[PDB]
Amino acid sequence: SVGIVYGDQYRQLCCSSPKFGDRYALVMDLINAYKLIPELSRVPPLQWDSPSRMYEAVTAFHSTEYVDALKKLQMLHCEEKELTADDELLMDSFSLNYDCPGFPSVFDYSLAAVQGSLAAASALICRHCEVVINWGGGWHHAKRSEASGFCYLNDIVLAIHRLVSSQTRVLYVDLDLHHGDGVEEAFWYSPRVVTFSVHHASPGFFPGTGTWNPIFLNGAGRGRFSAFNLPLEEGINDLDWSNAIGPILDSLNIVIQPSYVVVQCGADCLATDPHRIFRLTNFYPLSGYLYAIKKILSWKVPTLILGGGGYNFPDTARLWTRVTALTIEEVKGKKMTISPEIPEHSYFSRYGPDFELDIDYFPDSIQKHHRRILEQLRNYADLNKL
Numbered sequence: 001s002v003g004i005v006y007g008d009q010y011r012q013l014c015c016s017s018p019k020f021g022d023r024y025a026l027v028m029d030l031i032n033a034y035k036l037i038p039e040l041s042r043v044p045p046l047q048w049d050s051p052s053r054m055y056e057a058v059t060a061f062h063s064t065e066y067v068d069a070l071k072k073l074q075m076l077h078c079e080e081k082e083l084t085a086d087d088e089l090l091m092d093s094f095s096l097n098y099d100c101p102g103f104p105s106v107f108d109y110s111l112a113a114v115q116g117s118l119a120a121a122s123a124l125i126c127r128h129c130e131v132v133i134n135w136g137g138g139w140h141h142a143k144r145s146e147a148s149g150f151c152y153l154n155d156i157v158l159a160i161h162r163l164v165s166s167q168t169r170v171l172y173v174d175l176d177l178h179h180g181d182g183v184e185e186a187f188w189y190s191p192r193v194v195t196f197s198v199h200h201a202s203p204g205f206f207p208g209t210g211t212w213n214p215i216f217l218n219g220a221g222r223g224r225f226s227a228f229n230l231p232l233e234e235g236i237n238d239l240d241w242s243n244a245i246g247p248i249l250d251s252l253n254i255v256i257q258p259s260y261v262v263v264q265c266g267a268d269c270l271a272t273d274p275h276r277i278f279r280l281t282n283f284y285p286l287s288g289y290l291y292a293i294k295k296i297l298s299w300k301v302p303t304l305i306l307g308g309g310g311y312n313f314p315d316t317a318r319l320w321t322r323v324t325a326l327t328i329e330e331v332k333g334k335k336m337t338i339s340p341e342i343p344e345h346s347y348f349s350r351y352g353p354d355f356e357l358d359i360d361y362f363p364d365s366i367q368k369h370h371r372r373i374l375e376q377l378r379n380y381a382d383l384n385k386l
């Protein structure tokens with residue numbers, strides 16, 4: 001089936017943070033308003049039988065001391081008694097500050113997306129679902145011992161780690177505006193997890209990686225050549241982004257032959273995102289995201305589709321509703337007819353002023369990157385005997 005991760009507690013926790021507020025509820029209530037929910041298998045988030053099991057699951061990637069620091073931070077924020085100098089030092093040493101501050105549910109909230117993405121991986125492994133969607137997941141910046149970019153725990157690394165430890169090769173495809181640095185770094189030394197991030201990069205722009213360093217770094221040890229990056233200039237539209245990524249994705253699939261694909265589908269590339277870096281749409285006559293996802297799904301590899309960035313909440317929901325409907329279509333083979341008009345539902349008023357499903361927008365560097373990447377794909381294949 002097509003799985004989708006949700007649940008009452010999961011929804012409350014994914015909506016408990018100060019940065020993303022109720023985005024996740026808008027997403028899942030828009031998916032429900034368009035009657036897509038009866039087509040999807042509900043995947044419940046994973047729960048553990050003990051603190052020790054939860055700890056062993058999260059410290060498959062993250063360090064125990066970082067995990068202890070994040071739990072203590074939540075408890076500290078469940079008081080209003082502010083931090084001591086020593087606790088602030090401790091939090092600072094894990095970048096639990098500034099862009100990644102504490103708040104009352106920060107650990108539970110962070111853990112929720114891990115529980116979601118680890119259940120998603122399990123449903124794929126156990127053959128329940130061909131494709132599973134977790135729009136509460138996709139926190140690709142978190143590191144082993146460091147919060148970054150409002151990612152506190154890296155649910156993607158953990159889910160990929162569960163997939164590979166089920167020769168299993170995973171292709172990770174990161175469509176977010178921002179370089180997927182935490183997932184790339186986790187698998188820097190790992191040939192069986194090939195990472196491919198397309199993103200904006202430019203001087204001063206978060207997080208700073210995924211571009212020249214001058215040449216591209218692309219892995220080390222047996223991981224050499226297994227990390228792929230396509231940084232694009234600001235202002236790119238659906239068709240130019242589509243032509244830049246499409247032959248790369250296609251080559252990646254032909255050569256790597258992945259057992260699973262993991263797709264981070266962060267919506268901040270939309271023309272209407274407050275970033276206003278990329279000019280991508282959710283249009284489906286074509287949306288760069290719908291093109292890439294449909295391509296990836298035409299491969300017929302079991303596939304995890306995850307959320308990510310997206311700071312125009314109603315437009316993230318318009319995009320992910322369409323991704324969700326496309327997936328149902330490309331997997332079950334049954335047409336989904338979406339009204340161009342948003343249906344009445346609890347968040348209907350958020351879709352002003354037009355209440356249409358389409359976002360309210362009027363729409364050789366790449367060839368050099370293509371030859372670089374195609375040569376890097378050559379080295380990976382010869383290095384790995386494919």
Ligand SMILES: COc1ccc(C(=O)NO)cc1NC(=O)c1ccc(-c2ccccc2)cc1
Pocket residue numbers: 099141148149150176178206266268274275308309310311
């Ligand atoms: C630099 O920090 C980041 C770190 C990581 C990410 C991310 O998604 N990575 O994958 C994004 C940001 N940018 C913002 O936080 C941001 C900026 C601006 C807005 C905004 C929202 C509403 C109106 C205007 C601006 C919202 C969020």
Ligand SMILES: [K+]
Pocket residue numbers: 174175176177178179180197198199
């Ligand atoms: K990206």
Ligand SMILES: [K+]
Pocket residue numbers: 187188189190191192193194195219223226227
């Ligand atoms: K790798």
Ligand SMILES: [Zn+2]
Pocket residue numbers: 176177178266268308309310
């Ligand atoms: Zn982003």
